[PDB]
Symmetry: C2
Subunit: 527 residues, 2 copies
């Protein structure tokens, strides 16, 4: 995606490394001649580029046609008439099946700015790049504005554990229209029970309510920083922690304790200076954290990365727990996808690790917007300044560590009621709800790999609880067009999910729709 920003920052550190000038000083457009580089400096720079890229640029170019970083970036940024006639007639039958979605997207592109209108954009199939617009949904099905049914394995990006509009959720909304709901303004009469139930479900000691996962992450870091008096923070390459700037970064090349590089335009490097990216599940990284000792305010890990539902790095995490625990560093587990999905107690319970702060979201909102930060009082006390009682003469003891948090829509009266219902339902259903969801998901992946193995197809399915992804070398973007044409709705992020509402016939139509589609390009020349 945002590659040129990454290429620019890579050279800006390669140059800075070989020459000695601080990178916050290297104009990206200045001609190379004026940096005054040695000939070994220039071969070393030529080498890092031959390594990290395919290209071998003759150093003469640096003095002629590629005389500044900007121009190296633009250069460094770089079909059978058999296959053509299959897709030419695909793009046809496709676009004709979803023409309403394309018309609605064309008609609202400008007035409604949304980065999802761009996903899987390519200059040559631009006649078929637009999101699918939905009109309705129920259980595991979804209907687009053309009328096409879908089996939904997107499930609101993981929100809808129980499918769309499960009966107990609908009745909660219906109940809220009759009962003259308390308003925003005064405090929730229901957040108390939601928290208690969460504490019982998960082991955490105190619980706080925000408006999204991004907000929950943002606030968690602020809590680790306020409690440790520290400022630096490690997160891991490939994790996803929301869109708060202070976590939107990339790994500074061959860096250990080295500040990170911005992910994309508009993220200023100032926001990166208290952030370190390290590789996940590689023993070197614990050493760097160990090396940092009493430096880190926090380590923030996505227990199981939504990108790699395979990497279930048990050993890493317990090791990660020991390290952070003796250095007084807060361990922050991001359970926004896995919490209340792998099991009622989350990743913390599945890996038998107890973190200092966790963040929840997605499922725990019942369909409504929600982000939560919860954990030990030692940090949570930064939110209110510590417990106290009436009748004694106590006081917020952490008053001088108390930070700033707020929010208009915190503990929203409807949202708190939808959460409350999710938890009651989950504590009413047994462990056996999760066992039946996981085992349903295992079946689907097993019986998919078994079809891939028996006919030698470059596709494998990966899994953690009910979260599963495809892994293949074939052109995914086009494969997933075929699924979505085949009535199996998969958003562009390709995080797939099953719900308790997915039946036998849904589990079938999925395994089938991909069987027919591997047969659809086999017979199109994409084996």
């Amino acid at each position: 995606n945002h590659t040129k920003t990454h290429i620019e920052s890579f050279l800006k550190t390669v140059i800075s490394n070989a020459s000695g000038i601080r990178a916050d000083e290297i104009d990206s457009n200045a001609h190379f001649i004026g940096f005054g580089l040695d000939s070994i400096m220039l071969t070393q720079v030529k080498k890092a580029i031959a390594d990290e890229f395919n290209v071998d640029i003759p150093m003469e170019r640096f003095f002629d046609t590629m005389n500044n970083i900007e121009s190296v970036v633009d250069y460094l940024a770089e079909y059978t008439p058999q296959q053509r006639q299959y897709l030419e007639s695909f793009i046809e039958k496709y676009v004709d099946k979803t023409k309403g979605s394309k018309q609605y997207t064309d008609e609202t592109r400008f007035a409604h700015a949304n980065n999802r209108n761009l996903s899987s954009f390519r200059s040559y199939w631009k006649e078929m790049v637009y999101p699918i617009i939905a009109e309705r949904s129920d259980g595991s099905r979804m209907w687009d504005i053309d009328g096409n049914e879908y089996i939904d394995i997107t499930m609101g990006f993981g929100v809808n554990l129980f499918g769309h509009h499960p009966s107990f959720i609908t009745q909660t909304v219906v109940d809220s229209t009759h009962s003259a709901l308390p308003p925003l303004g005064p405090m929730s009469n229901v957040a108390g029970e939601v928290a208690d139930r969460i504490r019982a479900c998960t082991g955490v000691e105190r619980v706080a309510f925000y408006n999204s996962g991004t907000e929950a992450v943002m606030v968690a870091l602020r809590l680790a920083r306020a409690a440790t008096g520290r400022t630096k923070v490690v997160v891991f390459a490939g994790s996803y922690h929301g869109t708060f700037d202070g976590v939107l970064g990339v790994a500074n090349t061959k860096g250990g304790a080295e500040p990170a590089n911005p992910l994309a335009p508009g993220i200023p490097q100032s926001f990166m200076n208290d952030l370190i990216i390290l590789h996940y599940n590689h023993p070197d990284s614990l050493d760097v954290i160990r090396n940092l000792g009493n430096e880190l305010a926090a380590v923030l890990v996505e227990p199981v990365q939504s990108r790699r539902p395979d990497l279930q790095p048990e050993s890493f995490l317990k090791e990660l727990r020991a390290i952070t625990q003796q250095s007084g560093t807060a361990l922050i587990m991001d359970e926004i996808i896995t919490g209340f999905r792998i099991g009622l107690g989350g990743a913390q319970e599945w890996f038998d690790i107890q973190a200092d702060l966790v963040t929840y979201g997605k499922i725990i909102g019942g369909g409504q917007p929600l982000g939560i930060v919860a954990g030990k009082a030692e940090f949570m006390n930064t939110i209110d300044g510590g417990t106290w009682q009436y009748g004694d003469d106590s006081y917020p003891t952490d008053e001088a560590k108390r930070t700033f948090v707020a929010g208009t829509f915190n503990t929203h009266p409807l949202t708190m009621r939808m959460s409350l219902a999710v938890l009651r339902y989950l504590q009413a259903e047994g462990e056996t709800l999760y066992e039946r969801l996981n085992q349903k998901t295992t079946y689907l992946v097993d019986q998919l790999n078994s079809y891939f193995e028996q006919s030698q197809v470059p596709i494998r399915m990966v899994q953690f609880g009910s979260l599963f992804r495809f892994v293949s070398s074939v052109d995914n973007d086009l494969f997933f067009y075929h699924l979505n044409y085949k009535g199996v709705y998969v958003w562009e992020g390709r995080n797939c999910f099953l719900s308790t509402a997915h039946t036998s016939d849904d589990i079938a139509y999925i395994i089938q729709a991909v069987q027919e589609t591997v047969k659809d390009l086999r017979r199109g020349g994409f084996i």
Copy 2:
């Protein structure tokens, strides 16, 4: 509030100024003797403290009992038995009237961390410090878990323009339970019309949907930074722009272009280095912006500050518009409180100023969580990379300025429908809805000042459209306890609001409840 952090940072710059050592180097606990300060350096430091504080500290203290910054801070941080017996019997009749709220707060303090359990905390009246818990609401009334009615002038912090549960909002939720709502996952079939209506209501060219005002602000800055290739940003002292860290700062003392100081523990100064606070409506500040020239990525102003609904700085803002416009700097107006409140077209329409980006929230969500960022394509193009069409061979032209934004709950299907209804209702009602709300609010404030003037009371009411505040030298915290005891619910932030649902009797009971209460401490010894 977070004063010790501000005192510490003040000295850390006073010391650094007089001595020359960079403040990011001054250990806050090191003994003063070791900084090696001259005797004029030490008198100059003694002077800045006598100025900015009341205290005159003899320099000997710096070498004995106050030998480090930490100890200066703790020191620098510094009742008739007639009055006592009134409040002693108040705290009584109060707590007895709201004992359910106090019991619920005690019972959930620890399990539910929430900074609002602390507001108006004081060690001596700690027997009466807890939020009011609400059970119900309708129109302009709200009921606590004890049963006490209230006239609500909080109105969800400005959310409920039309009161609690106006009929057209309820019927929207009711409609959504029957109709098998489309899900999160695929894109909204309704966001297109919401945006168009907003464009027609407000003048903006493109519109984007997030999850809170904090998110909307956060994303707006990211857009100004991505479009201008710049990173520094000015915001103004006393504004409120959400809880995104990169705006949580305070004015570095006597600074113009100087980076700001963190607001509170846990905000690292790295986040402050691309942020400048300046005084609002003071001609010096436009000069500093002028001086910065092509430096600023953005200026972010709260058109009318929710703290000072008086300061309606017409002249400042148009001047602010000219400046930012010729330097290619994005002007960002934060209309989260004033948008769709002063009038359908917001502060932009009331002051006849057209900004580059605006943020909306609160009201525009219909009761549901929502934050919006909208403005000229020149910046909004950073969200999707620019319009394009089918049938031609166009392309996202701003592709290399495109930043990163996301969000699970963006354009939530219910929320988009509640927004859609707000706008239809607002475009169905005339300008005359706003004229009748404003004129209703003017009456209430006029007839309040007229009662204050005729009996010489240190209280004045301030106003912008339907937003009004109290301004008084008497102890507000206790005054507002009396109102809330008097059945007039005012949250701790004291931003007050009228709704279209406030009747003649509500407008009366308010003017009255404060009349009786000024008479309640007149007869208690607080004139």
